[PDB]
Amino acid sequence: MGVADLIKKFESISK
Amino acid sequence: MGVADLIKKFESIS
Amino acid sequence: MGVADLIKKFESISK
Amino acid sequence: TTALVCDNGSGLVKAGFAGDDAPRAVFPSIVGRPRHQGVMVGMGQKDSYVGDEAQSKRGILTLKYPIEHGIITNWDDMEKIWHHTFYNELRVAPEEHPTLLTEAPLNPKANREKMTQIMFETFNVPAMYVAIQAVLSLYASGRTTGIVLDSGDGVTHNVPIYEGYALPHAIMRLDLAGRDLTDYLMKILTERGYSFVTTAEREIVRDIKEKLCYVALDFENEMATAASSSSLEKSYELPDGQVITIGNERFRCPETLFQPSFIGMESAGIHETTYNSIMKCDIDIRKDLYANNVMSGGTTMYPGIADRMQKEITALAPSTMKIKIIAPPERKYSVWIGGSILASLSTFQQMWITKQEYDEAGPSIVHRKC
Amino acid sequence: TTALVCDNGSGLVKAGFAGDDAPRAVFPSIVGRPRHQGVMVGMGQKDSYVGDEAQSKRGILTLKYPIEHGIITNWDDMEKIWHHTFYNELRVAPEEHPTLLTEAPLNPKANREKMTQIMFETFNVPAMYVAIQAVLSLYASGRTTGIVLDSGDGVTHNVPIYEGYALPHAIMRLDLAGRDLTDYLMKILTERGYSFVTTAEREIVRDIKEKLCYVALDFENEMATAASSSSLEKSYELPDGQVITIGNERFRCPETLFQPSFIGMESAGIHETTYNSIMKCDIDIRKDLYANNVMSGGTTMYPGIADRMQKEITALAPSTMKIKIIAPPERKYSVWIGGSILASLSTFQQMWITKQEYDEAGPSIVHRKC
Amino acid sequence: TTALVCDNGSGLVKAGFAGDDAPRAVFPSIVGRPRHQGVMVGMGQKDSYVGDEAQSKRGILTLKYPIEHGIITNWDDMEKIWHHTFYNELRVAPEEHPTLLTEAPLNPKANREKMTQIMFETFNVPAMYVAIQAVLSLYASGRTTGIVLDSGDGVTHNVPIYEGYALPHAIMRLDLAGRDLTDYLMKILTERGYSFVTTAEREIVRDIKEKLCYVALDFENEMATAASSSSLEKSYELPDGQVITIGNERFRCPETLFQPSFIGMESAGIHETTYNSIMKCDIDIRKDLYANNVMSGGTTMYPGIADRMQKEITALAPSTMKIKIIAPPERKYSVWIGGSILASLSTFQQMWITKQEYDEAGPSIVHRKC
Amino acid sequence: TTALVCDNGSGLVKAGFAGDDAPRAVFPSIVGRPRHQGVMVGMGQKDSYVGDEAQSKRGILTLKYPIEHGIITNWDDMEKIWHHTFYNELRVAPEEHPTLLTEAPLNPKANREKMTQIMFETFNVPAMYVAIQAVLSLYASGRTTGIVLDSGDGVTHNVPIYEGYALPHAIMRLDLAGRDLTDYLMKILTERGYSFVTTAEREIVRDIKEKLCYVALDFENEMATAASSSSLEKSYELPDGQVITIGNERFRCPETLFQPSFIGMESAGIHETTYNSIMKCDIDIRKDLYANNVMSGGTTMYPGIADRMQKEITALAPSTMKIKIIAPPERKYSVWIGGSILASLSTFQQMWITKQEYDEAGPSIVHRKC
Amino acid sequence: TTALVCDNGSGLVKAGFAGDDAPRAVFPSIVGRPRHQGVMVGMGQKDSYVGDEAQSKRGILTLKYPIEHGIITNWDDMEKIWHHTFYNELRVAPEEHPTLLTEAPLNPKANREKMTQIMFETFNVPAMYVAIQAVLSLYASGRTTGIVLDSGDGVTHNVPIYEGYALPHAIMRLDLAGRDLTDYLMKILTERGYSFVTTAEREIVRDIKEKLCYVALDFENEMATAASSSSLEKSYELPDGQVITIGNERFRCPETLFQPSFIGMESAGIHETTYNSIMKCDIDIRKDLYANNVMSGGTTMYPGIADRMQKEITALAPSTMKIKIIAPPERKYSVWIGGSILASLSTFQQMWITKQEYDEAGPSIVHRKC
Ligand SMILES: Nc1ncnc2c1ncn2[C@@H]1O[C@H](COP(=O)(O)OP(=O)(O)O)[C@@H](O)[C@H]1O
Ligand SMILES: Nc1ncnc2c1ncn2[C@@H]1O[C@H](COP(=O)(O)OP(=O)(O)O)[C@@H](O)[C@H]1O
Ligand SMILES: Nc1ncnc2c1ncn2[C@@H]1O[C@H](COP(=O)(O)OP(=O)(O)O)[C@@H](O)[C@H]1O
Ligand SMILES: Nc1ncnc2c1ncn2[C@@H]1O[C@H](COP(=O)(O)OP(=O)(O)O)[C@@H](O)[C@H]1O
Ligand SMILES: Nc1ncnc2c1ncn2[C@@H]1O[C@H](COP(=O)(O)OP(=O)(O)O)[C@@H](O)[C@H]1O
Ligand SMILES: [Mg+2]
Ligand SMILES: [Mg+2]
Ligand SMILES: [Mg+2]
Ligand SMILES: [Mg+2]
Ligand SMILES: [Mg+2]
DSSP: OOOIIIIISOOOOOO | OOOTTOOTTTTOOO | OOHHHHHHHHHHHTO | OOOEEEEOOSSEEEEEETTOSSOSEEEEOOEEEEOSOOOOSSSOOOSOEEHHHHHTOOTTEEEEOSEETTEESOHHHHHHHHHHIIIIIIOOOGGGSOEEEEEOSSOOHHHHHHHHHHHHHTTOOSBEEEEEHHHHHHHHHTOSSEEEEEESSSOEEEEEEEESEEOGGGOBOOSOSHHHHHHHHHHHHHHHTOOOOSHHHHHHHHHHHHHHOOOOSSHHHHHHHHHSSOSOOOEEEOSSSOEEEOSSTTTTTGGGGGOGGGTTOSSOOHHHHHHHHHTTSOSSSHHHHTTOOOBOSGGGGOSTHHHHHHHHHHHTSOTTSOOOOOOOTTGGGHHHHHHHHHHHSTGGGGSOOBHHHHHHHOGGGGGGTO | OOOEEEEOOSSEEEEEETTOSSOSEEEEOOBOOBOSOOOOSSSOOOSOOBSHHHHHSOTTBOOBOSEETTEEOOHHHHHHHHHHIIIIISOOOGGGSOEEEOBOSSOOHHHHHHHHHHHHHTTOOSEEOOOBTTHHHHHHHOOSSEEOOOOOSSOBOOOEESSSBBOTTSOOOBOOOHHHHHHHHHHHHHTTTOOOOSHHHHHHHHHHHHHHOOOOSSHHHHHHHHHSSOSOOOOEEOTTSOEEOOOSTTSTTGGGGGOGGGGTOSSOOHHHHHHHHHTTSOTTTHHHHTTOEEOOSGGGOOTTHHHHHHHHHHHHSOTTSOOOEEOOTTGGGHHHHHHHHHHHOSTTTTSSEEHHHHHHHOGGGGGGOO | OOOEEEEOOSSEEEEEETTSSSOSEEEEOOBOOOOSOBOOSSSOOOSOOBSHHHHHOOTTOOOBOSEETTEEOOHHHHHHHHHHHHHHHHOOOGGGSOEEEEEOSSOOHHHHHHHHHHHHHTTOOSEEEEEETTHHHHHHHOOSSEEEOOOOSSOOOOEEESSSOOOTTSOOOOSOSHHHHHHHHHHHHHTTTOOOOSHHHHHHHHHHHHHHOOOOSSHHHHHHHTTSSOTTOOOEEOSSSOEEOOSSTTSSSGGGGGOTTTTTOOSOOHHHHHHHHHTTSOTTTHHHHTTOOOOOSGGGOOTTHHHHHHHHHTTTSOTTSOOOOOOOTTGGGHHHHHHHHHTTSSGGGGSOEEHHHHHHHGGGGHHHHO | OOOEEEEOOSSEEEEEESSSSSOSEEEEOOBOOOOSOBOOTTOOOOSOOBSHHHHHOTTTOOOOOSEETTEEOOHHHHHHHHHHHHHHHHOOOGGGSOEEEOOOSSOOHHHHHHHHHHHHHTTOOSEEEEOOTTHHHHHHHOOSSEEEEEOSSSOOEEEEESSSOOOGGGOOOOSOSHHHHHHHHHHHHHHHTOOOOSHHHHHHHHHHHHHSOOOOSSHHHHHHHHHSSOTTOOOEEOSSSOEEOOSSTTSSGGGGGGOGGGGTOOSOOHHHHHHHHHHTSOHHHHHHHTTOEEEOSGGGOSTTHHHHHHHHHHTTSOTTSOOOEEOOTTGGGHHHHHHHHHHSOSTTTTSSEEHHHHHTTGGGGGGGOO | OOOEEEEOOSSEEEEEESSSSSOSEEEEOOBOOOOSOOOOSSSOOOSOOBSHHHHHSTTTSOOOOSEETTEEOOSHHHHHHHHHHHHTSSOOOGGGSOEEEOOOSSOOHHHHHHHHHHHHHTTOOSBEEEOOTTHHHHHHTOOSSEEEEEOSSSOOEEEEESSSOBOGGGOOOOOOSHHHHHHHHHHHGGGGTOOOOSTTHHHHHHHHHHHHOOOOSSHHHHHHHHHSOOTTOOOEEOSSSOEEOOSSTTSSSSTTTTOGGGTTOSSOOHHHHHHHHHHTSOTTTHHHHTTOEEOOSGGGOSTTHHHHHHHHGGGTSOSSSOOOEEOOTTGGGHHHHHHHHHHHOGGGGGSSOBHHHHHTTOGGGGTTTO
8 A cells, every 4th residue: 555665665675 | 133033942951 | 798798708718 | 990790680680880789770671662653743752662761651662571581582672772781871881891691501502602792793892701690699698508599580490509519410490480470470360350461561460479479388278268258368559540459369479489280380399399409419418508598589589488498398308407598688689799799709800701712713612611 | 821021121111922022012101190170071081091192192191200210119100000011902811821020130129029029919920020131131142151231211230141150249230321311312402492391391302312313433523523514413393393403412412321421420431331340250251251242222222332332342451352242133122032032941930939939938039039 | 856657558547656656647548539510710629639628528529549459559649648648637847757658468569669769759758668567566466476467448468477477478368358348338238229329429338337337246147137127227317318227238248258259259258368377377386376366457346356256266276276366446546556666666766768778779679678 | 991091190180091102181170169149041051060171161160179289188079070081081981991090109098098999989990000100200211210200289209219119218298389389479479460369360370380480590690680671571461361571470480499488388499309318318329310310290391490400419419420310301291101101011910909809808908009 | 613414415405413313404405597587676586596495486496406316417506505504504604613425435536526625615614524325324223234225316326334344346326216216207197197397397296206105015916906996096186276196106106116127227126236236245244244234315215115125135045044124214314314423433533634634635635535
């Protein structure tokens, strides 16, 4: 629903 | 050009 | 009313 | 120099200058011819009296309308009217001003061309234009969406116009307007015991119609009422001094408009065409088209008619839809009121047909300028 | 006993016995209603005439068609027509003969049911049937591959058929036919100065469009010719005795078929549908389908139509592909010709709807025998 | 500054600012062309309207959709739509923001090119990108595993995605989408008696299908229910006033999506391709890939459709495997919800096609970056 | 009483008498199923056609191939084909003839059994025998030392054979024959703008990919070659009339065989198996086997593959062994040419399965005669 | 500072601290790299997963072992493996521990040398040492006299050892282990109808074989038994949802180890090597060695072989000498259990290879020390 943590900043999956 | 009684059963179905 | 008035009613809506 | 407009309906040709909010002259477009033996050198005996001047002296001359059902039957007589129009009611020079003319829709193409050729080769006016009476009438009401209904001196035409664009495949003509009612009113009065044959009577009947006739809000009741003892009777006095009383046959005259069977014509009344016209259009239009029924012309000046139309259209329309009839009391010149506007407006000033184009195209040019 | 076939279209109902090659009766399906007051007690001015004899006495009645655009509007009058057929043109007991009817595709199913119902419970015929008013036409030409265009006075519908199988997902239909052309030839006639408003007059115009019109093999070119001096003028004589001269508007009437914009309708001409119908079919079909355009219906009797249709298609069909219009001379009866051949067949007489079946499942049966 | 996402769907275009959670403007991507000859010289009639405004006045127009089945046919008017969605609908210059476009899978190469070229050189936008109208939709539900089914008014295409990787050898497609239903519901309406032919009317049907249809949870069962009288009758009101009563043919239109045997097409409905697409993937994928059928597109708003799908898959998929149709409530905008994220997303900002890199390579560069 | 060989190839069947060096009748093994409703009573339509006749009516039919990847998945249909082969394609009652059948290696056991059990019971043939669809290909070319490479609409496999001795631990297989090339081509054909979905069309792409594809002697160079405009653009004329221009995608489709990464399949292309299969054989053979490859089947008729192999293997095999690709220009029937020479062989009339033997063993006896 | 023991078995690398009695981390030594295109910007897909993680996402990558037949083919991947087990699966820097590695006997010297070099010049460990994959297994069972037999995915080698004294002139070897059984099973499995090609499926078989196979006790008697249907037919369920029924072909896939003639290898089954490799020893030993056959490795866990060996051997050796098979039910790690023991023995604490020693001798030093 247009949120940041992983919807607007898709989850920090660099590692 | 055509006739009154063009071929009846024409396709000859069995 | 009055045609002298309605002219503007169309003159303005003309553009 | 200003523009001229003479909405020459088949009856009282109205004419005036552009920009004015009222026509200048109004007069019965008739041509009088003396018939009886005239032997007196004193009288200023002319050969053809025109205009109300001719109307002022009926019993001595004859009457011949030059316009019959929206077309021009005889030309030379009609020619006098325009000539008498400019030089007596206006005293203005035709070539000194551009003019605008009117006409009903679906008119014979032969009428148009001659109306222009004469308008140039006998007056050399700068530019002449011919409008469709209904369209101008809308300009009068200031709207841009409605179904005109003009009728007077004998023509009847509904013309739907949604927005800017007019739908030519839904305009119905009708030869069932004021003239025949007058003729009918001359017939029905015979029952009561009166006589009217010569044209000089027709003017009387016309005036009698104009003030003692009203449209019944419901027909049979008025019949049932006036048949029994009632006060529908109204006394009128002829210009000689006699008096007549039209008891019942005072709403039977305009009722013809809603029942052509009274004369036998197969067509249906205006309360049936106006609906039967709309349904020719699309579906997304009929919403507001149902709500703008601007009337015009003389024949829409009857007292009761401002409502019998509203009641009727309701009877043959989807009930849940709303109806609003527009009826400006100054409608008797609406056909001409708009005429000023459609000529004073700025952008229109190019729509004209100067003499120049006529020279290089002849009368056939107007077919692409209507 | 033998089987009866009556292909009651929108104009002239056709009816005749099976096996024959020409229907017994042909007459305009109209229902006369006298309107004027009649005063003579001796002569039997009956209640309602019907048929050509009604057509004979135009000026006294109200010619009111019972069929409009394929569907049936008013029943009793229609019911008279069938009843006038069986007892005056054929004088045969309906209940003693199987009967077959025709009707255009894509029609309100409510029409079908109330047709077959009245066919049983008011005539008790042994077994009835309906059929696609286009398929029979294909049976006439003997082919089993082509695209019909039967467009007689009520509709215009193409029904492609590849090999005995129809293609119900590509069957266009157009509500535009002679019955509507007549109206257009009536409006455009007023351009000259004539007039026809009453239905009795309307029937006359239909009699003119028949023997005076022709389709321009090219429109803009031909129209420009008759605009200048030329001999495109003709001269028809009304039953009064006068004469009219339709100079240019003799090829502007049928042109409407290829440009419905003349009356506003958004759909395109038949030269579009016939093409824009084929493309809906598969790819391995279009080759021979492009080659057999059987035509039918009265509105395909115009002289120069058998060529305008070919030229138009080739203008938008791929070049290397070949088109060939098939237009038999007796197309005016093609439908009834076919239907005769249908009931004549032996493999087919099993398809009927036996009376007991209807009595078993009501009239809703026909929705599975189309 | 910020970025712009304008999903250029085939029906209602959708545009809005990147990063928000709802698109700004939505309006039927149609272009108007007035056809009826217009005579009102004062009014400022525009040449060709486009947008919801051109949708408001359906009366005098010729609604010509510029996008047929996810491809672009008419470029000019399409360009006009872009020119209208930028200035009049958003009042923001294009060259001030990088923009994102959407486009269906498996489209003609030429389409992508003549989209970018027009996007760059004619609007001087800084940078542009075009992604798949399926992958975008997955970002709506946030998942990185599932099989989209976005099918809005022009196409239908499942695109399996296991773990951020596509499977280009399984993308199906279908020209059996929303638009074609409107065509079907139009034909099936003739059954009752009503008839809509002009595109202005064809627009109305969309205002019925989308608010009176529902997917039968079991077709053959329910169709026998409403056969006998029941409460399946609804009564919609046209913008004219005459009401219609679609009794049965309200759950027979959307059924087409699960049975193209009605319009004649061969490829089975989506209740089969979806299962028949999954099986093209490997074995070890189908476990969870069976569990995420993220739907999208306007044609996924039918009430029942979210259930007949689930009731069908398990009816032909292995029983011991579980199915979970994740159908979000506001899927009508899912495609735009996606882009509004992917653009504002940080990492992706490297993939744009800058005017810099385009100007040395020409429009032939889109093929690699997408 | 002569023997009879009818290879049941997975694409178009091939049958003919034993001994003679040419197959009698070839026709695509398909089964017709009418899908559109049928309304023409007197038409001589059947319920399901089969054979090249059923190939001619691609429009109305629906083609369900009975063979898929070398297995049989539709028995009743397949049963008609043999029946349609014996009677209505050769007119030879099979009782008077012992027959020979073919089938690909590594075929599901349940298939081969049921083949016999039908071939005996419902036909009453004296003796039947099923060979390997590769061993027969050798005996065609006479040479008894080679590595066959079958292909074409179904399976693709190699079977090393040193001296009449197979090597069952080296037979490969692949579901990558022309069937998917005909299918993959119809995918990227969309890229240009065309499209084909209905199985009626899927038999047209085959008519393109037959006479318009060629395998590049070197892939990457050809791409950049035809990337810039050149003389690779060809044309083809559909059986409707509109033409297409497959410029580049005529050497990309036939090149899936050498890079199955295009349709996602993992196992490397045939340019690697044919080498990788060899290495599974003993050391003291390769030094000779490399010199004898015998391609065969419908897939290997391209102006390419017949050569590029000889170039490719050299990049893998050691540069000292000699590579020779036998490729007779009649290989398209090689599988049946050989099968003919084997039945007419003299020392072979013992290995047949006598109808007697099948009785006391049932169909299970086939598993000792292969 | 304890020691490190990470056996690099050709299948599941077993690694764990020294001294303990259970391997810490086991996982299939696989290396996978994605093969399909990637459309997911945010999703941080790595480049090359390794370990059971790469086993988990089985359906997108292409598992590709680095070890075949006890040798190392690719190194970089192998480098990742050790890099993964040190850092990820154990989180212990290498230089803090001496390390111990294993390797089958008779492996190409080039393999062993590189192993040390990478174990030193990349991880900088204190001391590395490689052992023999048999003598470790012996130490696990505590005995000091036996003939090992290890076989898991690759080698299969007996190594008789009398008393701490190997017999290098009797160490057999065979490349006939679980790998080919897993490979052969997916070849025989085709005959039933299923099929598995891509290396994704090649793990499924390895599972089905793992828990649905057992070595017969008398071959033919089993065949005739399972032929006439019985309770042999089991049923496994794939990770998709369908189920397969391996009726008979569940005791052939294990029955290769005793009959290499199924994949045509040159050698004989292990029920004969273990007899041969004993005979190659002296004659004063066998009379004891017949009583100690430690087994080991993966492929010694079928519910069969553990007791079929004790049967077959006696059919070869003289009767009076008695057979004794040792098969502890935890052997599947015994190769590493022993490896743990040898690390703790104080005696062994000098047999290492110090980092110092490697410097002044290079990798070549590992030969003399092992
Ligand atoms: N007071 C009135 N009541 C009813 N009808 C009238 C009245 N005055 C005039 N008329 C009718 O209206 C007509 C005048 O209409 P007119 O304006 O001349 O038509 P047009 O606009 O076409 O020239 C006359 O024929 C007359 O019959
Ligand atoms: N000679 C003719 N020229 C042009 N049109 C004709 C001619 N004769 C008849 N028609 C047209 O044929 C129509 C009659 O069609 P019809 O055969 O009744 O079709 P249907 O039987 O399907 O109603 C009439 O409307 C008329 O306009
Ligand atoms: N409320 C609704 N109920 C049912 N169907 C709808 C509704 N709204 C729209 N639709 C259907 O969805 C279509 C709109 O598709 P759309 O979502 O614009 O496709 P795209 O997103 O690809 O442009 C319309 O054609 C209509 O048939
Ligand atoms: N002239 C041709 N050019 C190219 N490919 C062809 C041609 N004719 C047939 N093919 C391919 O060969 C296939 C037929 O192979 P077929 O002989 O049926 O193999 P099999 O005999 O093993 O079944 C067709 O699917 C088609 O793709
Ligand atoms: N449940 C099981 N039963 C029998 N064998 C198995 C089972 N699970 C795995 N295996 C076999 O064990 C093998 C692994 O052996 P492994 O211990 O790696 O040998 P090494 O370590 O000496 O290389 C695999 O190839 C597999 O075929
Ligand atoms: Mg008047
Ligand atoms: Mg007819
Ligand atoms: Mg879309
Ligand atoms: Mg084959
Ligand atoms: Mg092991």
